Design a protein around this ligand. Structure first.
Ligand SMILES: [Cl-]
Ligand SMILES: [Cl-]
Length: 162
């Protein structure tokens, strides 16, 4: 297992513009296009991203390309964040994949506010962190996915991803 396979499992793959779990326009492998409710805004953003007139639909290769850039961006966002970087570098390789996944899903922003859990993860208090992490809007709105990530942080293995 690796980050790509893991996220590909959590986000799925769709070649036509769709609404995510929060109702925002998205495409490919969880690539948010816009938070605005105007589809046109979304189509414009798509075109801009891909570099061509898509008419709301892309190819697999196009989706995968966006995915690549998006993973990279997330990692790079982690690294540049003063509160995140130190936690991230203290973790082992599997748990770092759990960190990327949360950041990919919620933004460096959302994650940066998990101060307490962050500290627990840094101290290697696995079970305490798992309980803390569950006390969130994130776990309550997307519990199945949150559970998988949390078990990942808790155990340091890919068991939740089987
Ligand atoms: Cl792009
Ligand atoms: Cl879920």
């Amino acid at each position: 297992m690796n980050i790509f396979e893991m996220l590909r499992i959590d986000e799925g793959l769709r070649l036509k513009i769709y609404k995510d779990t929060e109702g925002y326009y998205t495409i490919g492998i969880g690539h948010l296009l816009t938070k605005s409710p105007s589809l046109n805004a979304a189509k414009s953003e798509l075109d801009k991203a891909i570099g061509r007139n898509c008419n709301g639909v892309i190819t697999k290769d196009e989706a995968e390309k966006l995915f690549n850039q998006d993973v990279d961006a997330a990692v790079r966002g982690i690294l540049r964040n003063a509160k995140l970087k130190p936690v991230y570098d203290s973790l082992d390789a599997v748990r770092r994949c759990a960190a990327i996944n949360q950041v990919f899903q919620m933004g460096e922003t959302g994650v940066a506010g998990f101060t307490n859990s962050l500290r627990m993860l840094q101290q290697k208090r696995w079970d305490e962190a798992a309980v803390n992490l569950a006390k969130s809007r994130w776990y309550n709105q997307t519990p199945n996915r949150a559970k998988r990530v949390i078990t990942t942080f808790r155990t340091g293995t890919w068991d939740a991803y089987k």
